[PDB]
């Protein structure tokens, strides 16, 4: 009997759909507690205390993570991040100059820090002209409502809660073009893949199965109603929002996942470490982290 708890984030894409058919608990056996977090930096805690075995992180978590040693390896992508994060400010903010002096929450070392930091780069502002904060996506939202924040980067389904009267000033298939894109990946645990390896296969299978007919033609899949109602629900999101949001990342097919993984997820982590070093996130990064990374699953 095996039991494993999967730390799962918001983001309303293709995959979602196996994990509200139960798929991977099916083909694998495995009793599976599905366990929502608000961000990554939570999971990387989890994951280190053992309290989770596989987990969603976006590359800026990963890359804290890898830099801390702790005993994890992505095993596939869940995406690589376009405009479903985003930063959204109230519509008196109309140019990234008008930034200076605003309050701007993100929840601290996710991809959203990382691309708010790097579009603050792009732009010539510094970190520190901006009252940058921190706070969890619920608690953006509540602030958001209340004008205690001017603006926030965000994942659904705090992006389109705030999108509905706000602007948005960039987003995360912009900060990418400008030579800081972001991906959301999933890793497991050495000591759980030591010992399930075939569960861990499982859960790649299920998740690549399940975007595989997105990829094929997302106009037919997202005409499916069950693909968007599945998708509403575990983001919390309206069903007329899913569309959009899907559509603002790429995923992968089995040859692109196998591609990815065999270099090009060890040099976006690099350069993501680089980049929190020099923004003085991270004390000290590697030049190398292929033992975050493995092909072996997919």
Same mark, same amino acid.
């Given at each position: 009997?095996?039991?494993?708890?999967?730390?799962?984030?918001?983001?309303?894409?293709?995959?979602?759909?196996?994990?509200?058919?139960?798929? #991977?608990?099916?083909?694998?056996?495995?009793?599976?507690?599905?366990?929502?977090?608000?961000?990554?930096? !939570? *999971?990387?805690?989890?994951?280190?205390?053992?309290?989770?075995?596989?987990?969603?992180?976006?590359?800026?978590?990963?890359?804290?993570?890898?830099?801390?040693?702790?005993?994890?390896?992505? %095993?596939?992508?869940?995406?690589?991040?376009?405009?479903?994060?985003?930063?959204?400010?109230?519509?008196?903010?109309?140019?990234?100059?008008?930034?200076?002096?605003?309050? *701007?929450?993100?929840?601290?070392?996710?991809?959203?820090?990382? $691309?708010?930091?790097?579009?603050?780069?792009?732009?010539? *502002?510094?970190?520190?002209?901006?009252?940058?904060?921190?706070?969890?996506?619920?608690?953006?939202?509540?602030?958001?409502?209340?004008?205690?924040?001017?603006?926030?980067?965000?994942?659904?389904?705090?992006?389109?809660?705030?999108?509905?009267?706000?602007?948005?000033?960039?987003?995360?298939?912009?900060?990418?073009?400008?030579?800081?894109?972001?991906?959301?990946?999933?890793?497991?645990?050495?000591? #759980?893949?030591?010992?399930?390896?075939?569960?861990?296969?499982? %859960?790649?299978?299920?998740?690549?199965?399940?975007?595989?007919?997105?990829?094929?033609?997302?106009?037919?899949?997202?005409?499916?109603?069950?693909?968007?109602?599945?998708?509403?629900?575990? $983001?919390?999101?309206?069903?007329?929002?899913?569309?959009?949001?899907?559509?603002?990342?790429?995923?992968?097919?089995?040859?692109?996942?196998?591609?990815?993984?065999?270099?090009?997820?060890?040099?976006?982590? *690099?350069?993501?470490?680089? %980049?929190?070093?020099?923004?003085?996130?991270?004390?000290?990064?590697?030049?190398?982290? !292929?033992?975050?990374?493995?092909?072996?699953?997919?």
């Amino acid at each position: 009997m095996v039991n494993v708890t999967v730390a799962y984030q918001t983001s309303a894409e293709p995959a979602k759909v196996a994990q509200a058919d139960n798929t #991977f608990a099916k083909e694998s056996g495995a009793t599976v507690d599905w366990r929502k977090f608000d961000s990554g930096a !939570s *999971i990387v805690r989890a994951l280190a205390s053992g309290d989770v075995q596989i987990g969603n992180l976006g590359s800026s978590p990963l890359a804290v993570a890898a830099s801390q040693q702790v005993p994890i390896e992505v %095993f596939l992508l869940a995406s690589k991040l376009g405009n479903s994060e985003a930063l959204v400010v109230k519509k008196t903010i109309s140019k990234p100059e008008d930034l200076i002096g605003k309050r *701007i929450a993100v929840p601290f070392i996710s991809t959203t820090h990382y $691309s708010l930091l790097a579009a603050l780069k792009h732009w010539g *502002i510094k970190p520190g002209q901006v009252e940058i904060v921190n706070l969890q996506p619920p608690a953006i939202i509540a602030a958001w409502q209340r004008g205690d924040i001017d603006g926030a980067y965000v994942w659904a389904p705090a992006v389109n809660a705030l999108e509905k009267d706000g602007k948005v000033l960039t987003d995360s298939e912009q900060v990418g073009q400008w030579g800081a894109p972001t991906l959301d990946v999933w890793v497991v645990r050495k000591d #759980f893949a030591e010992k399930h390896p075939e569960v861990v296969k499982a %859960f790649a299978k299920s998740a690549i199965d399940a975007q595989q007919p997105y990829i094929a033609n997302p106009d037919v899949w997202l005409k499916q109603p069950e693909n968007i109602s599945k998708l509403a629900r575990l $983001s919390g999101v309206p069903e007329g929002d899913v569309p959009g949001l899907v559509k603002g990342n790429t995923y992968l097919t089995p040859q692109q996942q196998t591609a990815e993984l065999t270099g090009p997820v060890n040099k976006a982590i *690099i350069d993501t470490a680089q %980049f929190l070093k020099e923004q003085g996130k991270v004390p000290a990064v590697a030049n190398d982290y !292929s033992q975050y990374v493995t092909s072996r699953f997919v």
